[PDB]
Amino acid sequence: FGEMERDCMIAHGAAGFLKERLMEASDAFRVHVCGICGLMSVIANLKKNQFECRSCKNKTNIYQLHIPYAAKLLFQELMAMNIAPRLYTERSG
Amino acid sequence: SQFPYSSAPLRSVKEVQFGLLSPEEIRAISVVKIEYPEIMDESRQRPREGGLNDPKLGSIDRNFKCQTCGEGMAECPGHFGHMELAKPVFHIGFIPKIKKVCECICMNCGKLLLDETNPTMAQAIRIRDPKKRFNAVWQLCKTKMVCEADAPVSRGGCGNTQPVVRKDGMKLWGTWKKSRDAQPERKLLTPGEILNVFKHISPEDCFRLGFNEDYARPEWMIITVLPVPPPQVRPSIAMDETTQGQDDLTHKLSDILKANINVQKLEMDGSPQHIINEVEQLLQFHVATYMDNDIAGQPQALQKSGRPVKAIRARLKGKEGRLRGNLMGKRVDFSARTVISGDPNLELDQVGVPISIAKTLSYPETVTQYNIHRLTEYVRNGPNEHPGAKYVIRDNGDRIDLRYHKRAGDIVLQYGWKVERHLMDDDPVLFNRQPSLHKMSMMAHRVKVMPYSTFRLNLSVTSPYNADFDGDEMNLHVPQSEETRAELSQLCAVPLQIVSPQSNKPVMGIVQDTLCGVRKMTLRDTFIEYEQVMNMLFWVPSWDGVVPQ
Amino acid sequence: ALEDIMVHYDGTTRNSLGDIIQFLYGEDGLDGTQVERQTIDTIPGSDKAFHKRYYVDLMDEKNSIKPDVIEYAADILGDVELQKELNSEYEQLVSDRKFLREIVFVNGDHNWPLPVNLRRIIQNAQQIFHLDRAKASDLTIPEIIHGVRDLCKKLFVLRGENELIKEAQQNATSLFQCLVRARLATRRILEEFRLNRDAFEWVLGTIEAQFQRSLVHPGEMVGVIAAQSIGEPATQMNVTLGVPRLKEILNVAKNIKTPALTVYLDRE
Amino acid sequence: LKHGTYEKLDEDGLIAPGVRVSGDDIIIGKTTPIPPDTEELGQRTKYHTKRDASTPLRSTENGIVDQVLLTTNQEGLKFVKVRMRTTKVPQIGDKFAS
Amino acid sequence: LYKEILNVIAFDGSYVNYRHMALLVDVMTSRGYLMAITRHGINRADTGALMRCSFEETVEILFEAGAAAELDDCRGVSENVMLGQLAPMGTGAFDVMIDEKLLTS
Amino acid sequence: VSTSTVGARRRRAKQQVDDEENATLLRLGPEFALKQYDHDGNEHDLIALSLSESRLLIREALKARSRARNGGVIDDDELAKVTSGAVANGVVKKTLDYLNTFARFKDEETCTAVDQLLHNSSDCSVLHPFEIAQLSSLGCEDVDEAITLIPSLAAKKEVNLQRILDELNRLEDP
Amino acid sequence: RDPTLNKTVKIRQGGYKGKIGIVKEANGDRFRVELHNPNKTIPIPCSFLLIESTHGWVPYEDFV
Amino acid sequence: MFFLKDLSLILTLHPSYFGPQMNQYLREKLLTDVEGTCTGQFGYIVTVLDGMNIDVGKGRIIPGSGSAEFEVKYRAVVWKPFKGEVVDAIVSNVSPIGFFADVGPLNVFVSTRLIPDNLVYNPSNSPPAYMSNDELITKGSKVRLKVVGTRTDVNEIYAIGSIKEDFLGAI
Amino acid sequence: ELAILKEERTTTPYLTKYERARILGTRALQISMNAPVLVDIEGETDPLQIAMKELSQRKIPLVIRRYLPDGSYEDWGCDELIVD
RNA sequence: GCUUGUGCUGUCUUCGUCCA
Ligand SMILES: [Mg+2]
Ligand SMILES: [Zn+2]
Ligand SMILES: [Zn+2]
Ligand SMILES: [Zn+2]
């Protein structure tokens, strides 16, 4: 599903179909993010039910996101080049 | 519902804040320190701790679990490590920016060469945009070549003359006009010295330069500690049945770590300055070509085969890069492709689908009291007969593969379960031909299951697709949800696309032998007898049963 | 370049930053699939033909409405209030003719894409209400005048009571109101189309409903549609022209291949 | 092992000419040795010492085995070639030209 | 600009509706000066870094965004596409709430 | 699970010493700071509650809920059993027992008089609400005892602590 | 596991009478048999088969 | 110490409950999910004031799943211990390593290393107790202790007290 | 604050095509997940057809929140928007 | 008494198919 097909689906106005194509029919992934630093550095043990961002030293302000696996890979490669992409779930102003 | 339960609330991303990573943050988010170049412990499995494939960095194996989060390969995202460098080095992407900042400030007392007393400087301060603010401040302070001990009343200036800094390779040279003519000396500006100078810059001066005290600090452009990506970023491959080859990034990190140990041992034992310079330039070259191997004006880092090293930068650019190749467009599931054929006996919004393609593709239908009997009939039919089904999905998400189930005839369906039934008649599907020049290249059709291995189209839709039947192929996409089916059937359907907004005229018409025949049949001297008239009238689906006089 | 441009619920066209690109999409706020070529009847012709077609004089007996087309033909001559209404209609038509001929279309072109096909609506009304036969019409002239005048103030492109909103709304429907007034003229309705009361009310309601249905929908990604609509002809295609000239225009090249001036001289 | 069948192989690990083959069926049986696990704790005849490296037929193809070749390579190890034969009848969607 | 584009399009007999070229030249002249449809025109805007990097000069744009501590508000379609979210366009330009008042009936 | 009305608090670089919870230093953290915000965003003060005030509030709320659930038609056990959840029932039973066995003021009017004395007093206009709650809860008898148990009151020597304690003992039912 | 998997079989009834095949899938009575000449696999009930043995063709019941 | 706090909860409702009784069902679900819970950030939530008149607002339909998400804001009474605070307690169990007390729902453990030496544990006593010449502390005896450390769990709080300072011990 | 009072609503009173598609999809999904139906179904079984029947009779219990570019919004009931 | 096994490389190069 190339870029031109994406533009055609934008021109149709079908946002739900585009989201389903690019996530459910492809690399859908779930990550946890700290609510303070906004980094994907949470250490989650789901069956032990314990979450922790060791850097920010917090256990309660943690969320889960559904993002493409390629987006996760891109953010990790950016982090490898010392760039800090921080994902926040609220606006500031 | 394909992910195991987590008590963390589910939210979406509203803002992305960019910035640089501080050494404190790199040390804090790390789970282990990488200091051993050897990948394998003793060539007897169980990779060495503190190495580039430490088991705390994450698990990329089916039977092994991550020692940091305890999750399996499917769920573990990978964890970062760090690698302390013996000497600081430049980040290859920020060297011109470091040069411009060095021009902007004073190399001895870390202060801007000009203050707000100059009205032009105040105007340069006023602009909110950090890039333009930095550009203006740089355009001003570049001219100023001497720190002012007193106000042009002491501004804290040390009075020293500002050198001329020129870039060559990754090395900056600061030419001081030491005290008409004299003998000027150009001395190397080592990364440690610039780092120390940047570290003394006040927060307010940092803000004046367009940097941010919290996220983007000027001394963080110098690498003192290197984050180590998890194995998920740099997976190993299986070249043959036995030997497995390491990724390019792993080899480059091994080279960096060897150079670091070399620098450290050399400094500790005995220090001829020339040898220090050689080995430290080797370390700088390795760190620079680990991130950018397309540096102009110097040779590329090569593999043992002679092919150049694949750097991180080259993973993100081009058609096959991360952005264009895996985010703006990707390969998707639930799709089909085959040759297309014409069918005069199909409706305008119908598509003929081969039986094998209908058996392969599926739609997950929710079991309700309106369809439970039909769905259990489909489940009894099985994955090899049409109309059948391929999977039964429980509420908890466990799939039941109907191929390898010995009691598929004894499966009882509960409300709320999902059945992945075969593609059936009148299911909306998206149909597409490349290149997709306009929005009429993707339209939603209705499925009709037919024999033989081609897709079948009404001939009036061949114009918007720009298709013919001399070998062309077209793609088909199956929606997987009720909302997505409604979107396809109410927005992208073929009848809704008859008139195009480009020229406010139709894009579909009568073509080919239908056009020739309608010209021939409507000539003034064409007459038809009663029996043929009855046949032609019965051929009309919308005919009301009344024969005209 | 155009991917993030969308029509919003206030009618404006904006990008992802909220910067306004157009205060109304297409300067008329209409969808590109809802317009057809129609002729504006006040633009062409001579002054004699325009006067003969549109002027109704209730004093002179040979330049009035025909007596076999209206049942009230007797008590019509000599009225002054009705003559004032007819004069107001004619002055509005003359103003429309001046406006179109002097500001909008100066070369006399009068076949332009507009919404709501009026000819189709009129012939549909004629077919539905059986407007054939020489039967006189019961449609009074003030009814025609007030119906057309009220119709020309219910074509809502923008909603609101602010004065700027009203000015923009009046601006957006100028050409369409000119078309409607040129077609639904009193003499034309009474003689050429021969509508009655029921047909007239049906035509007014149909015009209003169809104009409401021709507006662009908020949420449209008109930028991508414009990009595809411009790039599609480029696929199928001494002054440089074609694809190199399109490249020169889109790149804003400083040195074009064939610079040229178009110099116009004074009349003499 | 793979999901395909192995009953069409002979003692020498090679299929014989004249046998019907469907997709994924195994036509060449090959194994490579592997250092045994702690299964010497006691597994009389069921301790794994080999890993399967067999060659399956292409999933989209089927036909008849036409000829099986056995020889030795330049180095000196065994070397096999299996040829499959099938008939293709024209149908809807096949390309022709003058 | 509209006259030149119309000349180029209409020379070979083709026809394009006015609103498309009007939107194009309005984007090309909205900033007070001529903005070319190139990286020098498009990528010198105030849009988000993620939206600009996906066109051209990806790594340079990301390095500049990191050094400048840019904040992407994720309002464009490209950011939501590459984050796997419902883009604020078409059917995603509004929200759907549950009408408790009507449900009483 | 439940989220406070205070949000944001993003990453920075400075570290402060007024971050650890400490009753003696009167550092109650951000979520229990002296300044709070309601659902309307208006200014709001931290609301401490003594055992008398807490007992009155829990009894009032529980009896209101019990009356509402019964169609608008005193025992602690039945009132605890009104609530749902076995662990919730155990928690409310433990709180009811703790409050009952340490109730300094079981009367509404006595609690009202205590609250008015501890609020409208000029000396108490500077006292932190946590200090007020601790004084009304622990039932101290001596200034030295109160200072030892509550170190924050040592720095506030402009408070007529002894007479306030004697008034509290007088109001306390023997 | 059925004793008829990967065994040569002959069809005795229906539209494919007298065609030699091999049993590939056998779950509940609907044996999947590939046909030697037509490159296809067809479903068939166990009643319509004839399993080869060392002494001629045997019916399904008389073999299991 | 007890406090009044303005709390919020996110409640997700399945479409099968989209009926006229949606508001009351959400209220009872909120009560069952809030009353008696223990969150380390806040402490212990004991009761919710005005529990039958809580505004729930309008729920937002989650795209792709149909279920509505509700934001419910409420005021509740919350109790949380603090480091360095002196509170009363009741001894619940006696052990050689120390004694376990109960402060409402919270259980506080005090080790012998934080107990004065004269309060020697007597296991022969009926019931077993930590007794001195003039003091005798056993099960059910009123004790005044000072909270020194607090341990936070996923949905539990563990506190550690001490009685080695003045104005502590038996009361 | 961001909410706009019902008397001064200035957006179009007609249901757009995107809103119609999204409302039909959401209602069909809810019906397929066992939500109560507010219209009498004669013999209809398909959730989308039932949703369309509900829409034609103005019985869909959903609210559309239309967002303005500045951040404010208007709330419109599905029963007070004109549908063609 | 006897029970059926559960998956796949990477990187280049060349030749092709349908549009343009
Ligand atoms: Mg072709
Ligand atoms: Zn964090
Ligand atoms: Zn892990
Ligand atoms: Zn200086």
TrEMBL record, chain A:
Belongs to the RNA polymerase beta chain family. DNA-dependent RNA polymerase catalyzes the transcription of DNA into RNA using the four ribonucleoside triphosphates as substrates. Residues 1-89 form the RNA polymerase Rpb2 domain. This is DNA-directed RNA polymerase subunit beta. Zn(2+) 1 binds at C34, C37, C53, C56. The chain holds residues 1130 to 1222 of 1227 of the full protein. Zn(2+) 2 binds at C37, C53. Component of the RNA polymerase II (Pol II) complex consisting of 12 subunits. It is found in: Nucleus. It comes from Komagataella phaffii (strain GS115 / ATCC 20864) (Yeast). It comes from the Eukaryota.
UniProtKB/TrEMBL annotation, chain B:
Mg(2+) 1 binds at D468, D470, D472. Zn(2+) 6 binds at C106, C147. It comes from the Eukaryota. Zn(2+) 8 binds at C106, C158. Its main location: nucleus. Zn(2+) 3 binds at C69, H79. Zn(2+) 9 binds at C147. Mg(2+) 2 binds at D470, D472. Zn(2+) 1 binds at C66, C69. Keywords: DNA-binding, DNA-directed RNA polymerase, Magnesium, Metal-binding, Nucleotidyltransferase, Nucleus, Phosphoprotein, Repeat, Transcription, Transferase, Zinc. DNA-dependent RNA polymerase catalyzes the transcription of DNA into RNA using the four ribonucleoside triphosphates as substrates. This is DNA-directed RNA polymerase subunit. It comes from Komagataella phaffii (strain GS115 / ATCC 20864).
From TrEMBL, chain H:
One of its GO terms (biological process) is transcription elongation by RNA polymerase II. Residues 84-164 form the S1 motif domain. Its main location: nucleus. Keywords: DNA-directed RNA polymerase, Nucleus, Transcription. The keyword Transcription applies. GO terms for cellular component: P-body; RNA polymerase II, core complex; RPB4-RPB7 complex. It is found in: Nucleus. Pfam families: S1, SHS2_Rpb7-N. InterPro entries: NA-bd_OB-fold, RNA_pol_Rpb7-like_N_sf, Rpb7-like, Rpb7-like_N, S1_domain. CDD domains: RNAP_II_Rpb7_N, S1_RNAPII_Rpb7. Signal peptide: none annotated. GO terms for molecular function: RNA-directed RNA polymerase activity; single-stranded DNA binding; single-stranded RNA binding; translation initiation factor binding. DNA-dependent RNA polymerase which catalyzes the transcription of DNA into RNA using the four ribonucleoside triphosphates as substrates. PANTHER family: DNA-DIRECTED RNA POLYMERASE II SUBUNIT RPB7, DNA-DIRECTED RNA POLYMERASE II, III. Belongs to the eukaryotic RPB7/RPC8 RNA polymerase subunit family. This is DNA-directed RNA polymerase subunit.
UniProtKB/TrEMBL annotation, chain I:
Its main location: nucleus. Belongs to the archaeal Rpo6/eukaryotic RPB6 RNA polymerase subunit family. Coiled coil: none annotated. The keyword Transcription applies. The chain holds residues 71 to 154 of 155 of the full protein. One of its GO terms (molecular function) is DNA-directed RNA polymerase activity. This is DNA-directed RNA polymerases I, II, and III subunit RPABC2. It comes from Komagataella phaffii (strain GS115 / ATCC 20864) (Yeast). It comes from the Eukaryota. The lineage of its organism: Eukaryota, Fungi, Dikarya, Ascomycota, Saccharomycotina. The keyword Nucleus applies. It is found in: Nucleus.
